[PDB]
Amino acid sequence: MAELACFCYPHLENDSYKFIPFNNLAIKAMLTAKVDKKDMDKFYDSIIYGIAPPPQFKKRYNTNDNSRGMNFETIMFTKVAMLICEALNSLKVTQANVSNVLSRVVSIRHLENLVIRKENPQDILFHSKDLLLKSTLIAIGQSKEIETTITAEGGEIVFQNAAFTMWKLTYLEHQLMPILDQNFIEYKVTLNEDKPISDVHVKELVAELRWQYNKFAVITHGKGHYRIVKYSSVANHADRVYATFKSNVKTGVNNDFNLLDQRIIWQNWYAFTSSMKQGNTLDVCKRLLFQKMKPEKNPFKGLSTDRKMDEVS
Amino acid sequence: MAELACFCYPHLENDSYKFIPFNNLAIKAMLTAKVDKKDMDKFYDSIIYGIAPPPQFKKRYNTNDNSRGMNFETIMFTKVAMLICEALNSLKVTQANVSNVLSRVVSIRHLENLVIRKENPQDILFHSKDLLLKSTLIAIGQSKEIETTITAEGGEIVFQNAAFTMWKLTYLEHQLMPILDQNFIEYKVTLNEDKPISDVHVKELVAELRWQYNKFAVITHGKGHYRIVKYSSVANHADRVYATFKSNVKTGVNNDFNLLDQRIIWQNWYAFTSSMKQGNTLDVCKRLLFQKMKPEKNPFKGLSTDRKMDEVS
Amino acid sequence: MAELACFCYPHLENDSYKFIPFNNLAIKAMLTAKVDKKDMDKFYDSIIYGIAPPPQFKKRYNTNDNSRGMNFETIMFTKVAMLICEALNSLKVTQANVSNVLSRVVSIRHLENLVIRKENPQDILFHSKDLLLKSTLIAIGQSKEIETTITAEGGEIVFQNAAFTMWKLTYLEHQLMPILDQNFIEYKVTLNEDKPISDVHVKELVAELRWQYNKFAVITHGKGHYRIVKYSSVANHADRVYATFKSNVKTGVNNDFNLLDQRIIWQNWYAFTSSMKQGNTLDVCKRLLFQKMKPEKNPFKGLSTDRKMDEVS
Amino acid sequence: MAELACFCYPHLENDSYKFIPFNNLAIKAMLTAKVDKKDMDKFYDSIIYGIAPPPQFKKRYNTNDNSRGMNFETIMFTKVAMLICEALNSLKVTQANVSNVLSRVVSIRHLENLVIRKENPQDILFHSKDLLLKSTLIAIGQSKEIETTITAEGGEIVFQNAAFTMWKLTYLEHQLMPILDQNFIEYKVTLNEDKPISDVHVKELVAELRWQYNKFAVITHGKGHYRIVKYSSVANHADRVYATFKSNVKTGVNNDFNLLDQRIIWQNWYAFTSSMKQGNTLDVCKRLLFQKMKPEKNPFKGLSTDRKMDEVS
Amino acid sequence: MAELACFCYPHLENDSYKFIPFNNLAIKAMLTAKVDKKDMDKFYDSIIYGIAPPPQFKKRYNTNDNSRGMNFETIMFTKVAMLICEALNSLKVTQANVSNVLSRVVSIRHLENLVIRKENPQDILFHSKDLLLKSTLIAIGQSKEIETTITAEGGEIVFQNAAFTMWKLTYLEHQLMPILDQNFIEYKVTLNEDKPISDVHVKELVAELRWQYNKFAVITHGKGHYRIVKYSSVANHADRVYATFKSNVKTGVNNDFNLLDQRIIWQNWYAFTSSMKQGNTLDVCKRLLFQKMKPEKNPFKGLSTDRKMDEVS
Amino acid sequence: MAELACFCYPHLENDSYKFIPFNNLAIKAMLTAKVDKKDMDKFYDSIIYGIAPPPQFKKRYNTNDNSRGMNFETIMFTKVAMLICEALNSLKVTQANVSNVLSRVVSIRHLENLVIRKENPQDILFHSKDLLLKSTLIAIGQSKEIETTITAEGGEIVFQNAAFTMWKLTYLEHQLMPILDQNFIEYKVTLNEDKPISDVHVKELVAELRWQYNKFAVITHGKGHYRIVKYSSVANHADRVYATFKSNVKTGVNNDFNLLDQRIIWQNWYAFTSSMKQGNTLDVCKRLLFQKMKPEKNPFKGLSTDRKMDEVS
């Protein structure tokens, strides 16, 4: 998680704003700067190295006494900054929305993975510029089209159907916010189209999930892509997603939530998220998560046995 | 796959036989040696380096035109040979049984792993010599007590409750017959005590198996320990075990065969092995392996769900 | 051993076909792709990475379950694909030949040795483009000129005359179907001028062969170049050639077989290949190969002894 | 090529002599010593480092102005020296033959190979001391036993029959006097038992030689073991074996020569060595070497063809 | 020591000759070529790799049975070949001299050092092309202006006053014809201007020579530059220069000699080379080299003392 | 340059003194101690690590604000300390001489070279304990014997005749007080037998010196061994030794001086040291050093030419 105000800053074109990145050494210098408690929100100027973000975000960068911030001493920082610039400048930004446009939250891992799949010379985000442009727009939130496979968050395919795609997030090769654990592994599943999916395709996806990844749980953060993560973190995501909905109950922010087909999503998480979007209580709604309730072993029958007897060849 | 006549040869003690290993240099010499007919099954004497096994086994040693044989160019060879010596010498051998005692088949990987287990100082096969002696006797076949956990084939533990132990065979660090394939992962499961096992322990084992290892199929080779291997090779084992029974239907060896609890072993493999030991046809009996069965997904009910909602915290 | 439909695919220009290579990432994605039956011979579209060959050829790519296919995770795959592209596009292809043009078998090692030759700037396949076109076009099989030295399959020279050239195939530095063995050495011998050859040159070549390579046997595959391999594999070649002639007795397929001068080719292999082209049994004709028959130990007199007393200084 | 006066020196037991090695530092010191032209054969005493060989041998040690001498700056120089100790100390040496027993020429490479052999704990020269003692006695020349296989000069076995053994001299890992060339490779062939040999064993040796080593010639230095070397140096050996005989025509030293069986040895070299033993002229006798005399390709017939149709399976 | 026929060959412009280098792979191929007699002195054509020098020069290339010729496998070969081409083409070569122009002996080390100095940008043979051209002309022997400092053969400067320059030849970093000896150091001293030199400069040079290089002896080969080499190799140079004057006594080639000042050159070598050029006996003239001749110890007096008491500060 | 009170301290045997080394950790601890200005010369007690030398020597040990002291963190410190202990304890020490016997100066490099000589198992200071004992005695100044060769200060020999030995001090592989320069090189020349030396040996030493080392000057510090050092550092020695005599003019200290044969020692340094021992002024006597006075170039005649003409063969 982070704000867009940590990769660029606006600069007047006398009509509109051109966004410009920061310099590693510049923000490095600002980190050790010290200024009065009156101007701790306006952008700082490391006189030698250029502009640098305000001291307000001083606690969001990897310093000596706090390493829980974004690492910025790596080329990936300038890469993602140049990407955000190249994307935002095309979008004509006004002077009354840029105040909040530069504050749209974004999991910087998304942008990092966009960068990794953009510099590869085979991903179609290498040839077609407008595709990458729309992709970064969506990854920032300035578009309406939900993320689809053509504009997905990258990674290596691990399974594909005629209507789906199962990316395997590799959050261990990153250089901005790499995960400490060497055991953390998380899958994403996106759609190739936005049309009502058939039943045979969903049957195949359910088969592959409940066979090769039965040690994982299928959830969703409310956008158009099934997240998949180990049960040993479900309780996390709920709370981690709960605020994302709760803080969106506050006016001026969109509460648009997208739950997917209950056939594949985890039925317990399905009911929990339904009662969440319903408008129920804070914690008593989460109580339905730990409520062990599963009469059928798996949602459907006669499927795992099919793969069992299939792979025997 | 190996015969005992590739690590030792008998020598006369005027009352019994002392078995002595080979010098890897001596076998290497005999390999590129040549002798006339009528003597290709008589022990050869590399005059410079000592005795060496007859040229009969010439095609069973790792040379640059036949890599399908055992290696001898590593210290593991002399180690396993010295172990076989230390074991067989104590067992008093006659002058009319060594003829086929030195021909008892043995999975060289078993002896290799037992060696790599006796050298680690933390295992009880380091202190108690008689335990090591009994274990090597079992691994050779000169005793009746089936293998138990105290005398298992080594490897790193993965799961135990009170009557089971799930060894994870590591066939990728061996230096005698290391598996060329990168994806060769096999799990053995042995008993802690030969007494009839309760039902709670079996239910716990089936839970752990059908949760953490549902991509595997529990089979047995007819001895007292559950094998575990991917379905993508189960068929092999059938044929790979079939001769082991068929070549035992002819006299000269015992046809003794052990089953396990039908409640865990893969019921298709169970019925196949049952109709195998029954005495039916060769391939028409194998036909029951490919015959789809099990109109339910798992043998028990409401078990995987318990582990699902268990790990949620 | 491979088919042309694994390096490129056709694409319409509204007049003719342009051939386009694959993206290794795209074919790796297709590998895990699951598609319904009745369609598993159609070119697949990895939505993210471009087109990819149909799943029909799934079993012919180096994965973790099948390491017996063409490797593609190296740059040599894209290199040879671009070479085949640069080759075929020049040849104006119709819409009634690409059906079986992309099915002409080709020893992938041949194209590998080509691409390892066009990049070494010393050779003339670095300067004259049309020579390279003709060379790879022959290697694909779309012309009637047999391979000559100017257009040979590369490798390092080891001996020459006024009419011959003895390449030493190096199948150990390849990356596309490299030989697993470290003791597989094979020699090729090609002609410089397709016109009939004299007798002094053949005397010289037979001298050099029966002196420096008397531990090798001279055979052919039915084209214009003497293969040379250790006797310890002749039998293999036999059957590996037999099907090539057997599957070609099918009508509509060229069965034109070229046998070279009997004066140097292995007389037993010569008679076998003659009785093969005559048209006879499968194995009873092969029986002439294993039949020992040698009236004169070598077909000439005064060459081995000549080199013996020659090299004395 | 070396004299025994470069590894040890005699010392008085008041009754007999104990032979003591040199300190490599002491010989290095003497190397840069300068003494008057009156005592340039007396043993020099590097006062700091113990006795050192006389200055007469200055030209026989490797310095930066004469690198054609022995290398002593490696550990091997001590080993071989100590190895000579346990040889000569046992043999009671007379106060009248130490004058010339320390000048018996010896190919240092022989002793180096033997010391490499005695340290490999699998050879029988590691267990039985008296065997090592006898072997060093032979390699020095103080016994009449011709060097059999048990006492061979060591190396890697390559081929073995019931009466022969074909060592492959490895003169490239020697740290005392390696070869000026780095493609040099030379084989030795010794007899297992000094008694006469049959006609089947010799025929098999001739077959193996004319098949796997037809690019070599079988010669002999006069002792009881067939040397085997490339024709491209045979002439050298001639003069190298000429002087060692001619200098033995100078009475006072034994000229005992032993040419081996003619059926295997190179017939031209056989006739040359015979006319050498006759006492004929110097150069007109060598003239028979370069002269091409080819009645028949070999005193045997039907051997190359036999191995040809043998290896075919 | 080399001939010009090992780096280029002539090619017709229908009017004049363009010289073209050899593809090292092509000469490597020719090395193994076996062409009939009567044609062994005409340029060979490795059909695959281009032209290559005739087989006459076969024994002048570093192979594994003759390591006494020039190496060609290194990039320095193509470098010096391109240099010789770039130089010779400017010179208008006729059709009645090229036959002997391509046979002018040249110390390959000279060209090697010249190319290793023309790549270092600080040297003036980097900027001025015509200077490089004149220098290579001199090094080939197609002009009359003796080598001066501006056109010297490179190396590290060690000493300069006004009229001399003392290069330190580094024949150990070369890659074409390096010195197998690890310890070989040979200095050269060239003039700065062909005009007569004063006495103070010569006295300074003699001081520096008889002080810093007392362990060397100044000689000259017959050019305008003093050689300097250890006394331990004077004699060699003697005969090495003797043939150079002797073979030039044959008419058609220049026999001139440029003896330098008598005050600095080794007076014994001075008198010897003078009696050489006088036209006297072959070896009785060389006897003047070993005959100790001393009119004075050193041609100057009271000079080493000046440098002794000079450096004391 | 060091004082003996930096490797050991005395301890009471109730009758005499046992000398014991320091622990490098203990002295490192003492270095950072801060004791009152009343006891800065009493031995300190780093109570954790054992006794440590007084803080008086605080500035004599290497620390990161004073690196001009003696490194002690290496193993050679404990080595030389144990050597000094092993030497001093054997010597019976009173209770009124330990006051100043622990203050007799010693060139730490001398003891370092001793310990690097004692561990080399080929020198006679390895076997004979009493020899090493007398050597370490004289290296401290507790004996009358001048340092002969049998007890020399180690190093590698470079030249010996019958009464001299030219060690080449290697002050670059040391660890206690190594030299920071790469150009510093110093030779020592010691006598073998303290008896008067003849003329032939002296002439030979002068030959070797004025030929191979004419870029060095021979001096003496006032003991029985010629130092040899570059002229570029005579003056330093002239003053470095001067105090060594001047501070010995103080009553109660020995000023014995041993100037050697003027025939070989630098005659200017000879006269300077003579007028030094005479008892004259400080700088007006040193003035004779920079005075240039050299009628004969060297005290001998016709000697350099001898080696000149000698080395020619």
Numbering used by the authors:
A (entry chain F), B (entry chain C), C (entry chain E), D (entry chain U), E (entry chain D), F (entry chain A): 1 to 313
Which passages does the manuscript contain on this structure?
In RVs, the viral RNA chaperone protein NSP2 facilitates sequence-specific, intersegment RNA–RNA interactions to ensure robust assembly of complete viral genomes. NSP2 is a multivalent, nonspecific RNA chaperone with high nanomolar affinity for single-stranded (ss) RNA.
Due to intrinsic flexibility, the linker region was poorly resolved. The distances (∼10 to 30 Å) between acidic residues within the CTR and the RNA-interacting residues are incongruent with a direct competition model.
